[PDB]
């Protein structure tokens, strides 16, 4: 193989003295060359009102290093963002187990 | 013909799916003793294998029921098989095979 | 004038149709529905009784609202022209079911996803509601979810997903819901790993399931290997034992062996002295209660192909049977006989066949078992009030008596007043009834011996599916004790029914009652049927056309979907049957005890049945949602 | 984005096919979570 992505491989074959032949074409795969693997650039957490200047809370991301990447080859950058359901203590009064007394 | 047969003149199969005939149909020929029968026509793939074929009903007067697996066979005298490598590195020697 | 009777179902479901049954033991009656502060009226109804009609109300009615959002309950109050009587029930929140069907198994990065939703009710008929349709990864944080609404589609969702080129791998899932009742979810699964498409299948099988610790021969299994077009593979193979306990696998490194196959026929046979050294367990005794397994992979002769295949849970037992009580009264009966019925499986679940049972107490007191593995039994009663403890062991012949299997069940009496002692059981032979046939219900029955000529009448009813199906009243004349019900089994009641029986008697107030269970074939109401109207000349050929003929009941929708049957090869769990419906709609029924309670109360709280009268003689309530265990 | 009560714990993600510097400002009142993830092919110098 010579170049990256999808190629395309054909087949053809016939028979002697008979009216009979096929062909067959199919597609394959082709990758770089090295090993993948991913790194961690930035984990933060974000609660206005107790970090950031009156409500409004901006930070700033740092480019990755990639040093050592095989020429020729792209990238790819994921953020993700996620919220936190905190429901938090201070719940209902004592239960109706004891309750009997009254 | 007069020429014996070289490999100008000869197309090749291409389609090799895995599940097809997604679509939906509906029954409304006149009832035979509560039996109504309808006629459809398929065009068959160009792969050598086993189908398999399920269908399912549902009603407004009795409810919903479930079909038997249906089997169609596709064959063949003289043909070739492929078999390949899910991927491949780039730059290397690779051998594959015909049968 | 002297009592009035109310019969209700247990729980009521919001958003349907429940019956009550009036019995008058030419007056308008009126019933109606309030909340539990007073949220002003729900709904009222009238009728009128009339003696001609043996003063029979059949009182139906739709429970509708929005702000029914812990559980909750309702007032049912009805005047029978000059007095009143009332009862508080439960409501509930399941409204219907959620079916999820997806055209394959086991994908790859870059394709695609199809799948599709029914929806049906109670009564497993199309309806028309909101649904909200969640897709989890395998840790299990939600990727993607959705809201849908089946309004005017007959009730028939698709829809699609596609995988991206750069995904995690494992096991996904798919969640399904009603957007009223968000605590019942309805779930599926499938797999995301790249894989190519196998060439041939390969099957091993043993001679048999269990595994007898006594045999000479060990352990014999046969391996078949056959192409996907019908014909037939030539190749080697290597086999491999294993142990299984809970939760865990031991392999056996000495038992490993390598076998020609020829027209896809090979053989292999494990010995015990193997099995023996493998562990270190020299009392074989010790041995029961652990599982066998297999594996298999299988090569050509051309170096192309590679295929395993593995067969899980070989038991390790001594006694080729087995007995269960999952289906006995435990409530026996003073004076009258009392019925068994026993049911008998091989140790893999799958019932019996021709294999007889007995009582060691008794003799000659044996039958068969049908196709269904069920054996009909009797017995007779002290009658002293003590408690028995039966005893059932299999008589089978040709085999010697040290491998027999036997257990022991124990009974408790039934707590009448006045010595009424009334009770109800079919004679009938217990065999594989069929929608359309007929079945004769014989009140096998025994009075109070000195004034048994003043009793006029019963009253009978048949529950199926949580639901009052229909309800009866058969008399008789004076001096009888054996009378016949011809009832025609039909469709609708398909897959059980319980039917439930009682008579009231003048002291003090006496009332008796009875219940019995009973279960039909399964099979779908309707009819489809998919076949070739080709004229059937030889196979196809690729590229070719051909002729799909279609057979089912007028004014339906047909869908359709067509998979190669090499998918199922590499994963073959979790797909679509009609024997899935009936599991999942049988399972979460409201009676779950057999019947025959300890008294009044009891059967008729025993099978979601609820009972009221004028007088006072009223039934215990529940709240719960689920019977015990 | 809009993050609620009822759609939480839902992972939201955005793609980028280089990497250069950010500004990501956040309102409101409540607690989350951001992480960036950069995933390359690498140099690795066989049975």
Request: hydrophobic fraction near 35%.
């Amino acid at each position: 193989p010579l170049k990256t992505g999808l190629q395309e491989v054909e087949v053809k074959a016939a028979v002697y003295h008979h009216f009979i032949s096929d062909g067959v074409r199919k597609s394959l795969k082709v990758v770089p060359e090295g090993i993948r693997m991913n790194k961690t650039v930035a984990v933060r957490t974000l609660d206005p009102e107790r970090l950031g200047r009156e409500g409004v809370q901006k930070e700033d991301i740092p480019p990755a290093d990639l040093s050592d990447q095989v020429p020729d080859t792209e990238s790819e950058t994921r953020i993700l963002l996620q919220g936190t359901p905190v429901a938090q203590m201070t719940e209902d009064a004592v239960d109706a187990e004891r309750l009997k007394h009254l | 013909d007069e020429d014996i047969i070289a490999e100008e003149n000869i197309v090749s199969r291409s389609e090799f799916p895995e599940s097809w005939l997604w679509n939906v149909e509906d029954l409304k020929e006149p009832p035979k003793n509560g039996i109504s029968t309808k006629l459809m026509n398929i065009f068959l793939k160009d792969s050598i294998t086993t189908w398999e074929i399920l269908a399912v009903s549902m009603s407004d007067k009795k409810g919903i029921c479930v079909a038997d697996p249906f089997e169609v066979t596709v064959m063949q005298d003289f043909f070739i098989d492929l078999r390949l490598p899910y991927s491949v590195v780039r730059n290397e020697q690779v051998e594959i095979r015909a049968v | 004038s002297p009592m009035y009777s109310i019969i209700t179902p247990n729980i009521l479901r919001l958003e349907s149709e429940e019956t009550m049954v009036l019995e008058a033991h030419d007056v308008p009656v009126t019933v109606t529905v309030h909340d539990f502060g007073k949220k002003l009226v729900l709904s009222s109804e009238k009728t009128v009784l009339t003696p001609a009609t043996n003063h029979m109300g059949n009182v139906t009615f739709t429970i509708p609202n929005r702000e029914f959002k812990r559980n909750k309950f309702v007032t049912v109050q009805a005047t029978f022209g000059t007095q009143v009587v009332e009862k508080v029930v439960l409501v509930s929140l399941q409204s219907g079911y959620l079916f999820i069907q997806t055209d394959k198994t086991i994908y790859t990065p870059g394709s695609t996803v199809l799948y599709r939703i029914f929806t049906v009710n109670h009564k497993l008929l199309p309806v028309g509601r909101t649904v909200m349709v969640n897709i989890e990864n395998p840790e299990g944080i939600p990727v993607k979810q959705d809201s849908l609404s089946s309004q005017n589609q007959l009730g028939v969702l698709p829809l699609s997903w596609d995988i991206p080129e750069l995904v995690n791998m494992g096991q996904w899932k798919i969640r399904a819901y009603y957007e009223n009742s968000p605590q019942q979810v309805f779930s599926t699964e499938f797999e995301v790993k790249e894989y190519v498409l196998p060439s041939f299948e390969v099957i091993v099988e043993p001679t048999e399931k269990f595994y007898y610790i006594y045999n000479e021969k060990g352990l014999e299994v046969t391996i078949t290997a056959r192409f996907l077009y019908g014909k037939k593979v030539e190749g080697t193979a290597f086999v491999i034992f294993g142990i299984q306990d809970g939760e865990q696998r031991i392999s056996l490194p000495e038992s490993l062996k390598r076998i020609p196959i020829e027209d896809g026929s090979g053989e292999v046979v494990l010995s015990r002295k193997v099995l023996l050294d493998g562990v270190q367990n020299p009392r074989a005794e010790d041995l029961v209660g652990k599982s066998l397994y297999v594996s298999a992979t299988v090569i050509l002769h051309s170096g192309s192909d590679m295929v395993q295949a593995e067969r899980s849970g070989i038991p390790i037992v001594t006694s080729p049977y087995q007995i269960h009580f999952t289906k006995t009264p435990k409530y026996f009966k003073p004076g009258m006989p009392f019925d068994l019925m026993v049911f008998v499986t091989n140790p893999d679940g799958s019932p019996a066949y021709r294999v007889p049972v007995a009582v060691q107490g008794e003799d000659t007191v044996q039958s068969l078992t049908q196709g269904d593995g069920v054996a009909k039994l009797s017995i007779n009663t002290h009658p002293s009030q003590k408690p028995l403890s039966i005893t059932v062991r299999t008589k089978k012949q040709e085999l010697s008596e040290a491998e027999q299997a036997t257990r022991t069940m124990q009974a408790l009496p039934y707590s009448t007043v006045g010595n009424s002692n009334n009770y109800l059981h079919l004679s009938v032979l217990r065999t594989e009834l069929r929608p359309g046939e007929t079945l004769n219900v014989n009140f096998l029955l025994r009075m109070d011996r000195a004034h048994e000529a003043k009793i006029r009448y019963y009253t009978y009813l048949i529950m199926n599916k949580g639901r009052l199906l229909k309800a009866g009243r058969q008399v008789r004349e004076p001096g009888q004790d054996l009378v016949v019900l011809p009832l025609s089994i039909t469709t609708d009641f398909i897959p059980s029914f319980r039917l439930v029986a009682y008579y009231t008697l003048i002291g003090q107030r006496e009332v008796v009652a009875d219940s019995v269970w009973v279960d039909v074939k399964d099979s779908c109401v309707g009819s489809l049927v998919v076949k070739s109207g080709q004229s059937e000349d030889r196979q196809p050929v690729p590229g070719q056309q051909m002729t799909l003929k279609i057979e089912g009941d007028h004014g339906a929708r047909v869908v359709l979907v067509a998979v190669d049957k090499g998918v199922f090869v590499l994963n073959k769990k979790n797909k679509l049957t009609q024997s899935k419906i009936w599991d999942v709609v049988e399972k979460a029924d409201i009676g779950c005890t057999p019947g025959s309670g300890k008294d009044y109360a009891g059967v008729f709280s025993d099978a979601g049945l609820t009972f009221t009268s004028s007088s006072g003689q009223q039934t215990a309530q529940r709240a719960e949602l689920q019977c015990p265990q | 984005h809009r993050i609620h009560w009822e759609s939480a714990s839902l992972l939201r993600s955005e793609e980028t096919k280089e990497n250069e510097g950010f500004t990501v400002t956040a309102e409101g009142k409540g607690q989350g979570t951001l992480s960036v993830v950069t995933m390359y092919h690498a140099k690795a110098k066989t049975c």
